[PDB]
Amino acid sequence: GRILFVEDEDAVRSVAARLLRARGYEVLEAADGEEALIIAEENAGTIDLLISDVIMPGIDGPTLLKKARGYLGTAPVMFISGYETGVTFLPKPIDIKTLAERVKQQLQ
């Protein structure tokens, strides 16, 4: 499954991305919404899931969704934070077992 994972905190993003790759997903990482929007455009219609932090330097995750939803098609979207159809919310700190369960549910 091709996941676009948008998270400004490098160590949080990298852990989650590596653990998702260990489960067989392709994970395209972005550190901000402006990078994510370019990735979404260049991969339009091939992304299966967007996972995004809510509050990030630059545009927030929900604004990214508004800009990127067309490139994402019907892909589900999962927002994450320590604080439109197919939109879910997972609190931080992220538990990998729960993250993997939710990714699987949204993709199946």
Residue numbers in the entry: 571 to 653, 665 to 689
Question: How is this structure described in the published paper?
Answer:
In contrast, multi-step phosphorelays comprise at least one additional Rec (Recinter) domain that is typically part of the HK and acts as an intermediary for phosphoryl-shuttling. Here, to test for distinguishing features of Recinter domains, we analyze the structure and dynamics of the C-terminal Rec domain of the well-studied HHK CckA (CckARec) and find, quite unusual, its active site in the active conformation and indeed no allosteric response upon beryllofluoride modification. Rec domains of HHKs are intermediaries in phosphorelays in that they shuttle the phosphoryl group between DHp or Hpt partners.
The crystal structure of the Rec domain of CckA (CckARec, residues 568–691) was determined to very high resolution (1.25 Å resolution) by molecular replacement. The structure is defined by continuous electron density from residues 570 to 689 except for residues 654 to 663, with some poor density but not clear enough to model the linker segment reliably. CckARec exhibits the canonical (β/α)5 fold of Rec domains with a central five-stranded parallel β-sheet and the β-strands connected by cross-over helices. However, the cross-over segment from β4 to β5 (β4–β5 linker) is partially disordered and not folded into a canonical α4 helix. The asymmetric unit of the CckARec crystals contains one Rec monomer and no significant interfaces are formed within crystal lattice (all interface area <275 Å2). Indeed, as measured by SEC-MALS, CckARec was found to be monomeric in solution up to concentrations of around 1 mM. Unexpectedly, the divalent cation binding site is not occupied, with the closest water (W739) at a distance of 1.7 Å from the site. Though the CckARec structure has been determined in absence of the phosphoryl-mimic beryllofluoride and shows no bound divalent cation, the active site is clearly in the activated conformation. Like activated PhoBRec, CckARec shows (1) a closed β3–α3 loop with main-chain carbonyl 625 (55 in PhoBRec) in place for Mg++ coordination and (2) the side-chain hydroxyl of S651 (T83 in PhoBRec) in the inward position ready for forming an H-bond with an incoming BeF3− - moiety. We note, that one of the two alternative conformations of the aromatic switch residue F670 coincides with the inward orientation as seen in activated PhoB.
